[PDB]
C-alpha cells in the first residue's frame, strides 16, 4: 500500500517499510529478506535501453517496442510503488516523473505504466491516448486498475502493466471502443473478477509541457448494474464524440 | 559518489526481491486454482 515519496536513493524509513512488508507477507519472510539484504555481492541487473522510434517501425511495431520496454522493467510485486504519481498533477510534472522512470529503471505498476506510455508516444501525433480504468470486485474486496487506451487509424488497442497478461496490452485490432472494453471484461472473467465500474478519460495532449492535467473520468459506467447492449450503446456514443467533437473536461 | 553506489545496490536488491515476490505470487495462484 506504500509509495516512495522520498526520491532516489530511497530513504531509510521508506526502505525499512518495504522490507517489513515483504517480511510479513512472505511465508519464509525473515530468512528470505536477510538473504538479500546481507548478500555480500549482488549482480547489477542489466539496464534496458529506452526505445527510440525509427523509420523502419510501423505504429504496431513502436507500440510493441514500448510495451516490451515496460515488460522488461517488470511489474512491481514488492508492495512499494517507487514513483509517486499524483494523478491530478499537470502533464508537465507527470512527464518529468516519466523521464525519471527511464533513468532509475525500476519495476512499475499500472498507473506508472500509463504515465510512461504517454511519455513514450508523445512523439507520434497520429496515436491518441486515453486512460481506461476499472474498479472490480473479487472475494470481498474492490480492486482498481488502469491501462492506456490507444486509438490509431481507426483501431483501438492498449498499453499497460498488470500482474496478468490479459489485463494490459491489447493489439491495435479492435474496431470499436466496446470491443476493447468487452475484451477486458472477458479477461477479468478468467480471474473471477466482476467489473463494477469502467472509467474512460479524454485524449491526452501530445504537448510534453502541458499545463493541463489528465482527465480520467470523462465517462463512468456502472457496468455491473447494466445489460451489455446498453453498455455498448453508451461507449459507442462516447467514443464517437472523442473522435469528432472536442469535449469539455468533465472536471 | 556515495549516492550512486547506494542507488545501484538498492536497484539490485529490488530486482532480487521482485523475483521472489513474483515467484510467491505465482505459486499462491496455482495453489488457489487447485482448490
Amino acid at each position: 500500500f506504500h509509495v516512495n515519496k522520498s526520491g532516489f536513493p530511497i530513504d531509510s524509513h521508506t526502505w525499512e517499510r518495504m522490507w517489513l512488508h515483504v517480511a510479513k507477507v512472505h511465508p519464509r519472510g525473515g530468512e528470505m529478506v536477510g538473504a538479500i539484504r546481507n548478500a555480500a555481492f549482488l549482480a547489477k541487473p542489466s539496464i534496458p535501453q529506452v526505445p527510440n522510434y525509427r523509420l523502419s517501425m510501423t505504429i504496431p511495431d513502436w507500440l510493441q517496442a514500448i510495451q516490451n520496454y515496460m515488460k522488461t522493467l517488470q511489474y512491481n510485486h514488492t508492495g512499494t510503488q517507487f514513483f509517486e504519481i499524483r494523478k491530478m498533477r499537470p502533464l508537465s510534472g507527470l512527464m518529468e516523473t516519466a523521464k525519471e522512470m527511464t533513468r532509475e529503471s525500476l519495476p512499475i505498476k499500472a498507473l506508472e505504466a500509463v504515465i510512461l506510455g504517454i511519455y513514450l508516444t508523445n512523439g507520434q501525433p497520429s496515436i491518441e491516448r486515453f486512460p481506461i480504468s476499472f474498479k472490480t470486485y473479487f472475494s470481498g474486496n474492490y480492486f482498481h486498475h488502469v491501462v492506456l487506451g490507444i486509438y490509431c487509424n481507426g483501431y483501438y488497442g492498449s498499453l499497460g502493466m498488470s500482474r496478468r497478461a490479459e489485463l494490459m496490452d491489447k493489439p491495435l485490432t479492435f474496431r470499436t471502443l466496446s470491443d476493447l472494453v468487452f475484451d477486458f471484461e472477458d479477461s477479468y472473467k478468467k480471474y473471477l473478477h466482476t467489473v463494477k465500474k469502467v472509467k474512460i478519460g479524454l485524449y491526452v495532449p501530445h504537448e510534453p509541457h502541458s499545463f493541463q492535467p489528465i482527465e480520467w473520468k470523462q465517462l463512468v459506467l456502472n457496468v455491473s448494474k447494466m445489460l451489455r447492449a446498453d453498455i455498448r450503446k453508451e461507449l459507442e456514443k462516447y467514443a464517437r464524440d472523442m473522435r469528432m467533437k472536442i469535449l469539455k473536461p468533465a472536471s | 559518489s556515495a549516492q550512486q553506489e547506494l542507488k545501484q545496490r538498492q536497484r539490485a536488491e529490488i530486482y532480487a526481491l521482485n523475483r521472489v515476490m513474483t515467484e510467491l505470487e505465482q505459486q499462491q495462484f496455482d495453489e488457489f486454482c487447485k482448490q
Partner: peptide, 5 residues
C-alpha cells in the same frame, strides 16, 4: 490469496 490487478 487475493488476485491483485
Amino acid at each position: 490469496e487475493g488476485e491483485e490487478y
